[PDB]
Structure 1
């Protein structure tokens, strides 16, 4: 079954805890959003993994270069997974992956923004097994909605051998759009953190996922 991941796009740890204290046990993966990474630094990863050691902790650093250096910083902070931005030089993804293996962790290519299928093949040849199909928050704000082109691309990435994570302002009602595809993880940030009842929002996602898959 696709796992449920909560994106913590908070600017401070105390703000993030307002959410984790409610739904940490309701999700499978706790993500240190890029916003939290920039707001508090890598201490966010160390602090959250210490609080929820039984959960997968993802450092959404969107590494663009210095793959080995930035990845090591995140893994020394006890991250399980780290993200590398899609436009990064292939050697950046390779460097981050080499370090990830040292800590029994993994690397995800964050598909936020522009990337090519040739790049996608390089990631596979490099040993990358995860990608995050992400409808940009800014694109979303500009009126870009989920469409068949997205479903087609997601299926293509899956066929390439990638475990695909889907995210980008997902609402409960959006889940059916991806039915039939072996989605690895569904990430919900705003739809969970800002819901009237974060606990219910999280349980609803898991209920729908269990039903559809």
Structure 2
């Protein structure tokens, strides 16, 4: 269907996250427990947010790097729908997290950061991974803009059969760049949370997506 909209809750405490969710939870498709929230509060954040918003997809952005079975199970026992595994994890970390995900009718996304290869991407498909997150680092961005090499990479991932998420300092005005590509999800963190009107911001994203797709 259309690209879904995800809000990143990169907040240090639950109450800070709820300042955002109370404005926009019904304005989005996916609620992300950001890595910062995972580290701030632990998996209770996942459990609490799914209990509040059981009708939304809850993504635990844990960036699992090792111990795939243990960490995925902790997230899925807390009622996560989706979890993230970082691309530099061993392939068996990804496989282990996926095996657990399937027990809970959930899913695993590979977070694509810095160096990764097309040979790895094929490893992920062969393993039954069907989601990747094309994830521009904020620390790179604080220093890196979007460009054709990103678009080229995103199309190639999509062609390989991944459902592709696009994220990393995304702004409303960025959306037209990805026109024509079957983007699975766009994530907005700061550009929703920190807007003068978070509700207006989310609605602008959904409006633009509807228009472009």
Say yes or no: TM over 0.5. yes
Offset from partner CA, 1:103-159 (integer Å, 9 cap, x none): 0000000112321111111000000000000111111011x0001000000000000
Aligned to 2:211: 211
Whole-angstrom CA distance in 2 between matches of 1:23 and 1:202: 7
Greater mean deviation of Cα atoms: 130-139 or 106-115: 106-115
Give the secondary-structure state (helix, strand or coil) at the position aligned to 2:108.
Answer: strand
Aligned to 1:194: 194
Whole-angstrom CA distance in 1 between matches of 2:109 and 2:178: 20
| TM-score, scaled to structure 1 | 0.99
Give the secondary-structure state (helix, strand or coil) at the position aligned to 2:95.
Answer: helix
Whole-angstrom CA distance in 2 between matches of 1:113 and 1:29: 25
Structure 1 gaps of 5+ residues are none
| TM-score, scaled to structure 2 | 0.99
Offset from partner CA, 1:77-128 (integer Å, 9 cap, x none): 0000000001000000000000000000000001123211111110000000
Whole-angstrom CA distance in 2 between matches of 1:85 and 1:115: 10
Whole-angstrom CA distance in 1 between matches of 2:138 and 2:113: 9
Give the secondary-structure state (helix, strand or coil) at the position aligned to 1:191.
Answer: helix
The runs of at least 4 aligned residues of structure 1 exceeding 3 Å deviation read: none
Whole-angstrom CA distance in 1 between matches of 2:68 and 2:203: 36
**1:81 counterpart = 2:119:** no
Give the secondary-structure state (helix, strand or coil) at the position aligned to 1:139.
Answer: helix
Whole-angstrom CA distance in 2 between matches of 1:50 and 1:113: 34
Whole-angstrom CA distance in 2 between matches of 1:87 and 1:112: 8
Offset from partner CA, 1:48-92 (integer Å, 9 cap, x none): 000000000000000001000000000000000000001000000
Give the secondary-structure state (helix, strand or coil) at the position aligned to 1:149.
Answer: helix
**1:120 counterpart = 2:115:** no
Whole-angstrom CA distance in 2 between matches of 1:66 and 1:32: 20
Give the secondary-structure state (helix, strand or coil) at the position aligned to 1:11.
Answer: coil
Structure 2 gaps of 5+ residues are none
Give the secondary-structure state (helix, strand or coil) at the position aligned to 1:83.
Answer: strand
Whole-angstrom CA distance in 1 between matches of 2:87 and 2:141: 18
